[PDB]
């Protein structure tokens, strides 16, 4: 239909004719190829659709109107603003309580789409009171009573309320939403679990307080459980969430360790997906930046060789992650922990990266070597370490770094040579 | 407290040693007490160090300390920005030392990736021109791999995020460098450049048109065929976005060869690639009749039947749209061909899905096929075909008053063709 035919149908008293016009509106607006949103807005149909949302006696017009408004709101930011300024959010909220599952589900879908448009529209959805009725839909004793698709839609909408920054989700909304998320994390549907794991990863990517609210729920063991799921769509967000948690305090890290996360890292560090490998080595770098007893547990789980192997044969971006793992280890670790690291063969791959162009990495590696030499001084075995570095051609690499083109690297390698190779 | 004292020392080396210690202290992203660091007022000290052209190490070290601070909460990034770091970093881009430039590039990319507001501040202080001048060299292979990757990531962060989208002028400055970067051979540079274009193409048609007019689409299409998933994924997103634009923008994509690649995309083992490619195809079948005809000409209809029949539900849903868009805009002959390719049975089997929107969309597709049948006088033959594959039973199952929309749609088809 045309913008004229639809406007005539919508300005008709014949409610059935109004329904047909809105359906035509749906068909023109549902195409993601040139939906005539601008002229439909200029026609004043947004308030008409919003009003139709309230026609409880005609569920099809509510469903069709909700679909039209969502399609409009999925366009430019100004079009989303036009739908929100049209009063669509309260009207969608009123549809949440419909006795018709597909009607409430359309309202959930519409509200999740608005919220996922960005942080300002998410906060509007929260501001107008969407969280309470959305969560009330999951207040049932057994979550298996709800259909799969219905639950996935709700889970995705809540995920969207947790997502995005600048600003982060309001504190109060996070507090209200969190208990429902932890429950969903014990549901058996893979899509629900993925979305929930993503929701928690969003929540834990933020200030320490947020990490604290997540860990306190006692959900970290379940995250750790899902860290070993076979479904990569589940493992990836679970690993990110755990990774975010170990960027917090030494205690928050200990909560991750106590749940058994380290036991899963033998597979994660060799996972054929390079992204899982990198994220796993990132997460370990933040663990080895913790206490010495936490470094000891990394050792106890046989994780050091995997780190060495990663440093030796992985891609450069993952090797950089491993450089930070090793340096943090050497920086906080005990002398015996450093000997073990050298006993794992760290020197040779560590020296091979000294041909990288990354100044930061070069300087971080030299610092690691300095920390290894310090452990040697405390034992009085710096001579064997020096020869060892020379044996694998490490010293030649260090001397190659004495190039005046890079004064920071020149001075760093010169200091190392004066103290231990002079 | 001792760290602040070292920073406020008159001896040059002592200040260097304090900020270096600060860099190392900040190196580790493990619960650092920055709140007091802001209270102590160290951010403005670092920023001043960046201007110390005569002492390259101090510049390097402070750049590292400020970027570490800028990679936390919004207030920490805000403190860094209000500290005048952004202009300082921009001044640092012109350094004759490569490893100093890079540090600034990295700091600016982190700030810009924090969000749209800081992205626009980075642009507003004038970062775009000096960032691009670093890539204005004749042979990009002369630049170190790590240095180019950093620059390319920073550019993609300057094209990322919306509400608001990047400013138009900055995008028009950046796009010609993005073009040249997509001819580089490094897989990471290509991935980041494709991501940047996918950001630029995720918006209104006028933004799409900025991209298309650069002439870059044929190179994007070539990358659609890369073996590296981390390249195919964003290239495919970009192409899919561009085909959500005008019919003419869609023709640019077809003319660049895209459809020859879809036999591989539609059967790709990554289910996400299948989904995005079927999404992309659905937007192409939503185009003009000659475009539908090119889809037909490139042998793709059997591929779309197979996807509708055997793919996962998320991909099947995109295939449903692709089919309905085809039957909505296609000729009678194109629709006959669709039926000849076997679309009826896989389409009817999806009428068991619980998604009301998908159900109504499938029924629309059926009605459109029946309209082609009416023009040919073969509505009975079509009904028989639908009844034979159990389709009619599936339509009748939809006769449930608990869902009035589905009941009304399914009732119309039953009354009109199955009375």
Swiss-Prot record, chain A:
Subunit structure: Heterodimer; with KPNB1. Interacts with ANP32E. Component of a complex containing CSE1L, RAN and KPNA2. Interacts directly with CSE1L. Interacts with PLAG1. Interacts with APEX1 (via N-terminus). Interacts with FRG1 (via N-terminus). Interacts with ARL4A, CTNNBL1 and NBN. Interacts with SNAI1 (via zinc fingers) and SNAI2 (via zinc fingers). Interacts with BAG6. Interacts with AIFM2; this interaction likely mediates the translocation of AIFM2 into the nucleus upon oxidative stress. Interacts with RSL1D1. (Microbial infection) Interacts with HIV-1 Vpr.
Protein name: Importin subunit alpha-1
Modification Phosphoserine, positions: 415
Physiological role: Functions in nuclear protein import as an adapter protein for nuclear receptor KPNB1. Binds specifically and directly to substrates containing either a simple or bipartite NLS motif. Docking of the importin/substrate complex to the nuclear pore complex (NPC) is mediated by KPNB1 through binding to nucleoporin FxFG repeats and the complex is subsequently translocated through the pore by an energy requiring, Ran-dependent mechanism.
UniProt note: domains: Consists of an N-terminal hydrophilic region, a hydrophobic central region composed of 10 repeats, and a short hydrophilic C-terminus. The N-terminal hydrophilic region contains the importin beta binding domain (IBB domain), which is sufficient for binding importin beta and essential for nuclear protein import. The IBB domain is thought to act as an intrasteric autoregulatory sequence by interacting with the internal autoinhibitory NLS. Binding of KPNB1 probably overlaps the internal NLS and contributes to a high affinity for cytoplasmic NLS-containing cargo substrates. After dissociation of the importin/substrate complex in the nucleus the internal autohibitory NLS contributes to a low affinity for nuclear NLS-containing proteins.
Stretches the record annotates as NLS binding site (major): 67-163
UniProt subcellular location: Cytoplasm; Nucleus; Endoplasmic reticulum membrane; Golgi apparatus membrane
Main subcellular location: cytoplasm
Biological process per Gene Ontology, one example term: NLS-bearing protein import into nucleus
ARM repeat feature ranges: 1-36, 37-76, 77-118, 125-169, 171-207, 208-247, 250-289, 292-334, 335-381, 382-421
Keyword Ion transport included in the entry's annotation: no
Tissue/organ expression: Expressed ubiquitously.
GO CC terms: cytoplasm; cytosol; endoplasmic reticulum membrane; Golgi membrane; host cell; membrane; NLS-dependent protein nuclear import complex; nuclear membrane
PTM section of the record: Ubiquitinated. Deubiquitinated by USP22; leading to stabilization and increased activity.
Family: Belongs to the importin alpha family.
Organism: Homo sapiens (Human)
Keyword annotations from UniProtKB, A to Z: Acetylation, Cytoplasm, Endoplasmic reticulum, Golgi apparatus, Host-virus interaction, Membrane, Nucleus, Phosphoprotein, Protein transport, Repeat, Transport, Ubl conjugation
GO MF annotations in UniProt: histone deacetylase binding; nuclear import signal receptor activity; nuclear localization sequence binding; RNA binding
Region annotation (NLS binding site (minor)) ranges: 240-328
